Amino acid sequence: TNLCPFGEVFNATRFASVYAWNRKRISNCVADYSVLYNSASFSTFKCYGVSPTKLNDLCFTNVYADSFVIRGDEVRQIAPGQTGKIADYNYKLPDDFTGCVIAWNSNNLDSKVGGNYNYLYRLFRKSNLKPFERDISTEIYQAGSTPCNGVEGFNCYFPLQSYGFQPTNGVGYQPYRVVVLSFELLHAPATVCG
């Protein structure tokens, strides 16, 4: 019964927005990645630094599970060295990233008629994010040389933005649930095997 809670992340009910992604650290348990492949519901299942076929035979110090929701057009930006609104302003992975990137379509769950305004994404930011940096600031972005004084208007836009997922949208704009597993290896003993 010492199994790592995989269902608590993938089979979760709510998924955070990409600008305020949710991270759950997993340690001291048995990680069975074989049941992950036995689902076939994932559109993207790519790993970096390790081979996904040779998984379930490794050990790591800590395992961080970052879960959020973006659209299919932006799933390509969940990779080291990528650019775009998601990779620069919302969730940036390091170049020396050693983990796996899992994603699957959730149109029947994260999309309602008229627009699912529950999910947001940062659109404007004065600079890009660092690896594993989260920016939840709602400061009014100054688009031009005109100041804003915390009030929206001309050249002053709200930093966040909603997706408005609809079931009738294109496949690129439909919502996709992403779970980025980070495998940390330090000089400390490992706690996640199995």
Next chain:
Amino acid sequence: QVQLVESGGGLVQPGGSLRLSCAASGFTFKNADMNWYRQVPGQGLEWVTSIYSDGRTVYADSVKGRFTVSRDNPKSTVSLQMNSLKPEDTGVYYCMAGSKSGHELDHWGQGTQVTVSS
């Protein structure tokens, strides 16, 4: 210039009632979706409720039966009747209008602080 003017924050004891208002100017209000979000200092925005142009109202399960959204289309006003408040409802509330026009952006309000504690 699209503007959203928020109003109706303030301090309230656990169990009080509030009525936040959103003043919309610069677009067709009768054909726009209006949404409410609250942000506790330290966390991201949480979707509170929404009311579409169809008049359909959708509420989060955390405020089910306690909040209510109004839509005064001639006045172009979004009213959020916040009733039976709890300390967990403390935070800055935002009303935003968005979408329907493609190359547009969701316009947001300036926010109103709401505090509930004793």
